Amino acid sequence: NIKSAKKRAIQSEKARKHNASRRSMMRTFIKKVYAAIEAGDKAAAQKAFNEMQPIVDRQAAKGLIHKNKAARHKANLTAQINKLA
Amino acid sequence: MVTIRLARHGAKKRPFYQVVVADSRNARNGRFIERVGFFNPIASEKEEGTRLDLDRIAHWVGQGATISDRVAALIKEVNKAA
Amino acid sequence: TSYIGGEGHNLQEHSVILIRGGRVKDLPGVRYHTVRGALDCSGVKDRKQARSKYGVKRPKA
Amino acid sequence: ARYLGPKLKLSRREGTDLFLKSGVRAIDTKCKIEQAPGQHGARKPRLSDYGVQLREKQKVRRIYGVLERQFRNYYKEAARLKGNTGENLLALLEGRLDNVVYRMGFGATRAEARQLVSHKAIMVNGRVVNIASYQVSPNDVVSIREKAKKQSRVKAALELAEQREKPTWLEVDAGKMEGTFKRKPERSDLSADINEHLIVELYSK
Amino acid sequence: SKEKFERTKPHVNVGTIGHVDHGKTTLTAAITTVLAKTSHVEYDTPTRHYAHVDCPGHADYVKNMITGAAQMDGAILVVAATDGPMPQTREHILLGRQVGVPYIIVFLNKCDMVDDEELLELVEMEVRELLSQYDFPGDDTPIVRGSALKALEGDAEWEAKILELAGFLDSYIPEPERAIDKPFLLPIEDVFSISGRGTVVTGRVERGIIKVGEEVEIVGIKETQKSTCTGVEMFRKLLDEGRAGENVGVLLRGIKREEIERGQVLAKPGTIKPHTKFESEVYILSKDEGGRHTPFFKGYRPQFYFRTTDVTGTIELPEGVEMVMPGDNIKMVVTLIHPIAMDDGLRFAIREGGRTVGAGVVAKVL
RNA sequence: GCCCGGAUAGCUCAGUCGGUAGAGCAGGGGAUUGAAAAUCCCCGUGUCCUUGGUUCGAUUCCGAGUCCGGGCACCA
RNA sequence: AAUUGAAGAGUUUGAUCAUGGCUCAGAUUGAACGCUGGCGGCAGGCCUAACACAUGCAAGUCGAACGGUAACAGGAAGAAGCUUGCUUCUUUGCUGACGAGUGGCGGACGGGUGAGUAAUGUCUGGGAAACUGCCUGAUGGAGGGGGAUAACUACUGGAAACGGUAGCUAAUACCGCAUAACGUCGCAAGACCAAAGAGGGGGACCUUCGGGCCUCUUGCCAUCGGAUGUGCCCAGAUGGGAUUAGCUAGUAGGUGGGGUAACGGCUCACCUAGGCGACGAUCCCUAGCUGGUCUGAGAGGAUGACCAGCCACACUGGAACUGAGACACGGUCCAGACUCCUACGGGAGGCAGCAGUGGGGAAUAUUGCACAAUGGGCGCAAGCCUGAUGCAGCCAUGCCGCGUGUAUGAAGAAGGCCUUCGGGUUGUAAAGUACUUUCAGCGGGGAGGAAGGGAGUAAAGUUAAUACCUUUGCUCAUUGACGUUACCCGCAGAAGAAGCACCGGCUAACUCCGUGCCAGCAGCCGCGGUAAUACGGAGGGUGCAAGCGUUAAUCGGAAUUACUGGGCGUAAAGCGCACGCAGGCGGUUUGUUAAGUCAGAUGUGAAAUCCCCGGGCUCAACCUGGGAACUGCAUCUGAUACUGGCAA
């Protein structure tokens, strides 16, 4: 529609594909610890968890994730790795 | 957001102004928390015509309320000191 | 069906009109009156009384 | 809003004088009073109970020169008062300014004073009021505009007032064309020949 | 819509009259082509503004013919060289005079088809004598030759003769008087249900002036109501002030399509009232001149043509004259079937069945 | 504004390819009666919408206008 | 001071009293029709098609964020006329400012509609498993680098829309690093996570001569708060039909994982067999809810336009991204219908935003003016945008004010009408006569709505500083759509201004002529059959008034749904009779609980409206201050009669 406020539409799409690149990267690491926890390797899982720790909290700090999701993904996952340990 | 702005009620050509404490994202005659006094620029040269519960105004000031230009000038005109 | 109240009218086969309610108590089955002075319903001629009814204009001179 | 027609006819219907056409003549007698309002006046009205209600209602209305819309509102403005409606109703009827100047004598008759008021000739508390239905407050003073003072009409009016009531609920000087109004009219001090009891009962159905 | 019109040049409304296949539609495009270097087209000159009227030259379309005659200050008589004095061309001189055209430009067309000056001068003479029989100084009318088709294709020789046409258009045809101080009057000719603006009525301003935001009222055979001139467009060109003589459009104050039709009259508030009874002075024409072949009678109902209309009315002949033969010079009372503003001195035409039988002139209103 | 159909006594229609307008349903006018139904005695109230023409001659032939219903436009 | 409040009559029958329907007298309305029509103030003005939509407008803004400057206006260098600085004129981002672009913010508010929705909604009252940009309070940090890209260029596809290829550059845009706390995770140890710089001015000092440096203002990053907004949860209330009686299988619940800001069948896997239901589930039809408005003595009944709170929707259906906030009116993507452009491959659009047009309909209006005021967004600010709002046009649609003149006036006429032709009546009515002038029309005066803002200047804090910044005064010019204003004065002449229903009873007010159960009247009983108080006309009279009637519509009269406040032998109405579950109700004594109830208190019951007392528009309507009420719900502390629970 003819409005100079259509600038938000193009700013949305450039911010769209960018957020997909960040979130898919964020969710990729979460799947990584799941594979490690399923092999019974409590050390590798502890290792992989240490990898995504500075990642998910680097995402909540910028304003992307609402920090409670970041907390929970770590929280239960914290109790998950020591459940095997 | 919160603010201590006015709210123009009254008849046509004979305006009235009611200083009200409300969320700034609401209409002029919209919802509000409370009205704190009023203002009549077309009343008369009688005994009254303007009342502002200065204390409640200042109570919201510490809370974070923004006083609008019209009433801020009106506050100093009603003599806070005198 | 509707009653056409008045002394002399010109409604024939079509002449779209206006209908105001009200029973008449004479003809069985009719509860409507045709408004005089609307769409095609002309005013009743020779009227000097009750012209608010029958759609009659006030005498000129 | 007014009758502005054969105004003396209304006094013939009720069979009583209402001071509607007083003028310079004290007693009329040339109106054929108490005999014929209209053409079939020789007949006799039956006066049903509802009929005596309506005739009593109008009696006071022709004198106070008001109409039903304003009359019924005066009743409602009388209905929301304490005590008694009837006595308070005659207070609001006499509350009109045109009644006061008539009681003052500035205006010769009822309708005449209305014209006097509506022609910006009367002033009260320094404010000229054109509204005839001005509710007069107790303890105040009315006056006449300087430019519209004594134009031969008010002169004839005051001399007529010497042969009337000149109520006690107001004080007139008649020397400086300035009169003051005291407290509201009392029931024991007014006409009393008229009835307001039925007017209260008529509007209760 | 846009583009406000500049009121700098005088607006003289002219039009073409004649017969079928003389070069009518061809010349309409020819005028606007060279100057740039019923349907209407316009053309503007650096000295004045001229409106052009193209009317159909067929007998059955007399309804469109008379409506086109209402905007004729200077008739452009286009006569083909291969045809000459045609009956309707003769009738256009007749009915043109019945509405009152003062000056007429005679244009000899299709001169490219016949190179013979002898007969072209003779066809000119035939038109000259045709004007003389209808009280027109045919010997004082500037004769201009020309070719319609070739001038439109770009033949500069025939195109330059269009300048001679425009030359006589500025000399033989002067700017008429505009009674602007007199009460505004306007012949309603066409109605346009403009999508988005409502109902638009068009016409040529007879008297007074007009301007956007002016209260107007419509008088005529239909009961008179109130309206408002809310928009003055002239071929999609807005105008702030239209004076008398202007061929503009007036936007109404929201009326429906089927109320205000061809026949009424837009006028200035409370100025001109309608009339139901009047007497006229007539000049009954002959069968060869255009009238009937049999004398009509009392009660006979022909149509009356004034300014736009073809309104029917009963002819009230004076008692005694029951047989009015073709060629009579009498006066009779006229009872119209519908009330309409009748001014004494109004020149009109008495027609019926597709022919003009009499030349009406309103004598007195009864 | 253009293209068609009905415009036939109160009502529905016939009659027509030039020859002095019909029928049915009506209804109405009289005697009997307080007033009628019922019975009987008599029965058409019409500018074939209007105006005009080709005329010894037009309901019907050809033209127009106006009224109603049915289809198309046009877009200062 | 704050509810001082309630009418009936006509009609069944030969007549009466009953029962019982029917109808009218009242009030009101988002009104419509007919007739009439002078002015003004305040409101209302698409209820039907949530029908389709031409065109303009309805949300943009910031250079004190950045690269740039395509244009406009200057400076400077230069250059040509030529009066040698009077002009002409080519460069130049060096300034004021500024199209297009990057970025931040707004666009989720404001505005409109009521289609959908019978409980996922709303209202009342409690509640905890949450979040919250802008604003404000407290303590801190703000150290150091890198990599692209739009605009701009070269070229190029396409009718346009709209792109494509290869290069150029900056930042509060982006991505690391450093550094971490009462922040997050964890039993703990420990582990882990942030960012941005600009603007004004200036002494010393310093100038790779951009600037560093000092200071003031502004903005940014982290955490706990507050306030506001928002999401969510339980209980109760919130339509009709039982000719709808069984219904549900993520359905009821548990453990574990996942998912959301948050609890949760919100969603999955396994397991169990439950959950809802006559104090109404599912099903069917209708409908936005509430504060309120109208009616009514109240209780209730109807209803939910305008103002306000809330929810839902945005051509239709659907999904999701962005973002603090939407799963979105002037945003996107996909399918479909309807329009539209087309160079026929392919694209564009959504008035239930102001107006406006067609169409529907009995019916509802201008394609107006200004951002002066209030409110909102951006900005330090000045300002900019603002169809919100403020006003105007139009309309008797409603309420309220007012005028169409006042006084005098008897041949007590003319004309009209009735008549016992005597006369009466029209009728002090008019005329004649004497005065005044509202509102209209004309011409001049003239408020207030205006608070502030810009420049200049003084004092005091700020600072190294008389500078800059900021706070408070003083001064100049002022910022007004309405607007030919409200109001005031002057001028002229009664000069410009009254109709409508009815007139037999209900229900105020009559005769005459004419038509003869014909024409017509009507709300009901009914009038009219050749003397009509009821038809039509004439006069007179009556009700009301710029309104008067009619019709639709709700309530009232209707105690004809009766809780307040009705009935059941014969008038409509006792199941043919009985047993009996759930349910309703219960003798008498004490104790006890304090549930209901009762007393007082608390929070709350939004505002407005309504009731009272005052104030301000010439008065009124209207606007409006304080108060009361909001007849209610929840909690706490007491009372123990009556009711209910347990025990004897």
Ligand SMILES: Nc1nc2c(ncn2[C@@H]2O[C@H](COP(=O)(O)OP(=O)(O)O)[C@@H](O)[C@H]2O)c(=O)[nH]1
């Ligand atoms: N050759 C030729 N033909 C002509 C000329 N002028 C007009 N015409 C013809 O006239 C014809 C139609 O002319 P027009 O006036 O438009 O007729 P209308 O509009 O139907 O009455 C066209 O076919 C032209 O060929 C001319 O100058 N030369």
Ligand SMILES: *C(=O)[C@@H](N)Cc1ccccc1
């Ligand atoms: C509209 O353009 C009118 N001014 C002229 C016109 C043109 C064509 C048809 C009718 C009127």
